[PDB]
Design a protein around this nucleic acid. Sequence first.
RNA 1: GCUUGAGUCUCGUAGAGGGGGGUAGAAUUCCAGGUGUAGCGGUGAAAUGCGUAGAGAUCUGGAGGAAUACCGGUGGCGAAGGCGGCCCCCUGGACGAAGACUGACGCUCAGGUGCGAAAGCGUGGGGAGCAAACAGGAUUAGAUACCCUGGUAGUCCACGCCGUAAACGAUGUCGACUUGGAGGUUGUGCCCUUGAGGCGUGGCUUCCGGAGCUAACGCGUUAAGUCGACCGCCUGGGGAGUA
Lengths: 271, 70, 129, 99, 88, 66
Amino acid sequence: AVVKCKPTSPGRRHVVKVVNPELHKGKPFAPLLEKNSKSGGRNNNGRITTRHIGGGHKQAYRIVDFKRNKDGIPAVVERLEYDPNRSANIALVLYKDGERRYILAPKGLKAGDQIQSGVDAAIKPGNTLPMRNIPVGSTVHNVEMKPGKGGQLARSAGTYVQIVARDGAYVTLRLRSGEMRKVEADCRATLGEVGNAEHMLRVLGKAGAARWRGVRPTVRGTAMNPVDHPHGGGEGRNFGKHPVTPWGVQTKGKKTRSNKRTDKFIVRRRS
Amino acid sequence: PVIKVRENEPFDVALRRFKRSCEKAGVLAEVRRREFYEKPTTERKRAKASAVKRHAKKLARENARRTRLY
Amino acid sequence: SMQDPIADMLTRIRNGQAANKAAVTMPSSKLKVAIANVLKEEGFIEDFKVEGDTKPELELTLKYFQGKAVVESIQRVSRPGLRIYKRKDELPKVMAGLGIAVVSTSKGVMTDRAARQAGLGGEIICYVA
Amino acid sequence: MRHYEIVFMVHPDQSEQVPGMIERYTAAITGAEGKIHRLEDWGRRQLAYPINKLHKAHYVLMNVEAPQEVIDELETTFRFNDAVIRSMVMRTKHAVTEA
Amino acid sequence: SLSTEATAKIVSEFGRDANDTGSTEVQVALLTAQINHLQGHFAEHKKDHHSRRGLLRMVSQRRKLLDYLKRKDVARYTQLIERLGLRR
Amino acid sequence: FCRFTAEGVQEIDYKDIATLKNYITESGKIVPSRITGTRAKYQRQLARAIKRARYLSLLPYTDRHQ
RNA sequence: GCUUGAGUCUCGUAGAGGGGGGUAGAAUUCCAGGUGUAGCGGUGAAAUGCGUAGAGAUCUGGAGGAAUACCGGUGGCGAAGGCGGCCCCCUGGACGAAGACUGACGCUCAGGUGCGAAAGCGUGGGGAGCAAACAGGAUUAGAUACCCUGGUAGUCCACGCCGUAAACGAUGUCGACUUGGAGGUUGUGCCCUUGAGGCGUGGCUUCCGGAGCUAACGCGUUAAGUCGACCGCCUGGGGAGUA
């Protein structure tokens, strides 16, 4: 559950951690592992393109099945595994014929649960259906944005998507940010809500925890010099300017969606 | 509420039917109740005071009013 | 929850005299029978009848002089929260000797003057006046 | 084994599928332990308010003596079925005999 | 709420016969069985304070009956506390 | 006078909407017991059955509603 | 030892008793469109506010949140706080008829422990309506108030904390006794169902009153009458339920 630490050190004082007993204590399934080389936020020209990224514990990539193509075949949840690459936990899933796959774990999902994908399966949490046969009002996760593409929406821990309306070929969903968005009804979705919903409560205690989660320190623009940032400079803490990105674009209010080709699929703006 | 005017009828009689029907249905009383919110203390006190005033009228009428006055 | 049945007998007697009842029934007991016997001797009741086999009751026929009740007042003295014991020269006088003080002494239940003549004190039960 | 009354209302345009539905519902119950005490197929009548802008639903009534979990499965069936538009289930004291 | 055949099974396990339904041992065993079933109930719902007051009435009643049985007969009391699994 | 005692029924059923239609008013409200004279427990059963028949669209809630 | 107190079983009843989940209908607001026009809203009177960028009115569709009109009752249930659509699942207590069983197992309770309205606190959601604070317009000598137009916390949910109220029938809990009358509510028994009935017998409850009590008001078989057991409390007003 949610375990607070006892203040036997200051960095140990402010720690709240998420202890999960049902996570399987052991090495992961090596047929589904790849290696994951870090970047530091540096692209193929080697320059920093995303700041405040670098360092961190080594982590191996686990191939999570998002598409759920194995249709009309039952599958039993074998265990819950810790994924380092993710906010959620993964579930090792053994199909009836012998194939094992990682899936995103739903909220109510423990070992022994029979799940099934397809167009016909069930409406138990864990089953994957296209959004032609899922009822209006149901809570889905791992929603696709194109048919057969694989599944992009509602994928962090505790997140989900409500099917608001059906109209013709399209399904109006309400995403986790409150944005109402249209999808094609042949896009699949896994029923239920993503588990590990107590993920947001961990408060990390110390700087070293955010340092071994892979995050590198943020210098504020006021602390810098006028060459380095638009905010920089001053004799003892002057600001005097409107807040901006380090490349001189206005932050703190200014909108920057400029797509025009997915604006047709938007029903309401995020609010 | 809905008052269907029968053919060959005077208008004031259909209006009287409508006013009688809205007086039985209790429309303006229930609308006059729902203009301002009353606390449940005020509602239970209004109910208790109404009951005590009703029975103080009845206990006066049934035996304290049957005698002759002059 | 019925901690004193003797005081319950006295209360039934007092409510019967005040309510002008003829006879008062109660559940029976040996000490109740002895106290009612002392009242029947001194003339505050005129009869007492016990009836039942495993469940006995006791009926006291109350006494009335033409308008009022014969017992002017009755009080309980050694209640179970405060038991009152008196030696034979500290024995109580009720209404300057016109009312009886029922005392259960070491030979049995009797009155105050019966205890003073018999020469022994005991546990007071009631003041009958 | 408790005695439930089930009134469920079906679309008029899908009223032709009502009998076979009823059959698998009896096959839902009579296989496990439960008995049907009444099957009073009312038929099609006009509603008092436009449920989903439609009227004239097909009322079906059935009385069961049943275990509880199969009735929970029946309520899950009435949930995701699109033919129904209302379904009340009720736990009565005794069985009911006539119509 | 402890239906009839279960109560019959306890009465003809602790009673002098089937018509004996009111001894201290029968009453303590029926109270203990209902306490265990409600312990199943109060694992969930966790805020049913009224049913928990009903349970606490029957727990204190079982304690009073067992204290009577301890004062009356220590041999039957010790046999019942080894039979039924309560520590004191 | 009470008519549910005069017939002698044990439970007011929600299905016979002739009786429940008789015991409501024209606007859809449950008629008070002080004027129909029904006894107390049959008035409670009457309100229960009228609400249950209101659920199944066997009776309207209001007379007005679209 | 015994069965009168207390308890257990069998069987039926009534119930907003609790906890979880789901669903229905009206209404308010918002969003989108149709029609159509210069007002709407509001007041003791006005103004702020909204409206010619199309308001308010009306029709259709949808989105959410909250509370459950009628029933509704000087009704009911609960130890109190309190509990109102409907349905299901888990569950507590009370009560009645006829029996049977144990055999005083009982009453009260310092300290202790639990439940405990509303407001408030913490974390995570939710947010229609209402609305502290706040703003504007009024009234006024002034108006940091009532009044009006807005409006955040909060009200709602999950989980903990708080532990107080005019938490009140200002009436501790239990047991017994002591004239009555009219009601309500919920069981059960009998007479010919001979008739929307007559007769009793239990529980709970509202009003009036007898003796008695009371400083009086008033209470009055549900006592503030007559008694018993245990507990809590009071000792002039203020300072002070304060340091």
